Design a protein around this ligand. Structure first.
Ligand SMILES: Nc1nc2c(ncn2[C@@H]2O[C@H](COP(=O)(O)OP(=O)(O)NP(=O)(O)O)[C@@H](O)[C@H]2O)c(=O)[nH]1
Ligand SMILES: [Mg+2]
Length: 168
């Protein structure tokens, strides 16, 4: 590979972070996945502007009550996938909180992609696509909706953020 880019997954418990990771790196999905224990990471190489980018994707539980995610989790990260669940409005309301965590614990110029996951649950949607896109636009974030379940836009989400990082 030509470059190694560390990218972190963050977002509330249950939004689909671990399945976004497994879908992208192993093409695997699990309806019966449990809350993540400690910290995990996995890799996949992809082509970006004629270069081979080894994407090192980090993952951890969204809940931070007794245990808060430290600057060590974010160290070296050049991107963050900030994931919410399109069918749960609270997870979108908490995006502001995750942005604060990034400001507190992550690099100043970390590339942020706001990810509305579970787009296959369109019939249960609680967060309008236009509102989220507008919010992203107004806060200097990229935006995409994904479904780890049916694979829609998962490759595109990672390919796009890794492209934006490469092109900084
Ligand atoms: N319908 C649907 N379900 C999904 C999707 N992505 C994940 N899920 C489901 O949502 C639940 C939680 O997914 P998971 O990946 O474990 O979430 P998490 O964000 O890693 N949770 P935690 O922060 O606690 O580790 C699981 O039942 C999983 O199968 C998706 O795109 N669509
Ligand atoms: Mg998880």
């Amino acid at each position: 590979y030509d470059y190694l880019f560390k990218v972190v997954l963050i977002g509330d418990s249950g939004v689909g972070k671990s399945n976004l990771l497994s879908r992208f790196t192993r093409n695997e999905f699990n309806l019966e996945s449990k809350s993540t224990i400690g910290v995990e990471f996995a890799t996949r190489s992809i082509q970006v502007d004629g270069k081979t980018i080894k994407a090192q994707i980090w993952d951890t539980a969204g809940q931070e009550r007794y245990r808060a995610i430290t600057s060590a989790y974010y160290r070296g990260a050049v991107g963050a996938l900030l994931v919410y669940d399109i069918a749960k409005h609270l997870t979108y309301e908490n995006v502001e909180r995750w942005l604060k965590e990034l400001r507190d614990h992550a690099d100043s110029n970390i590339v942020i992609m706001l990810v509305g996951n579970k787009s296959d649950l369109r019939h249960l949607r609680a967060v309008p696509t236009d509102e989220a896109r507008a919010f992203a636009e107004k806060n200097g974030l990229s935006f995409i909706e994904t479904s780890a379940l049916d694979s829609t836009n998962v490759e595109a989400a990672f390919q796009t953020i890794l492209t934006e990082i490469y092109r900084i």
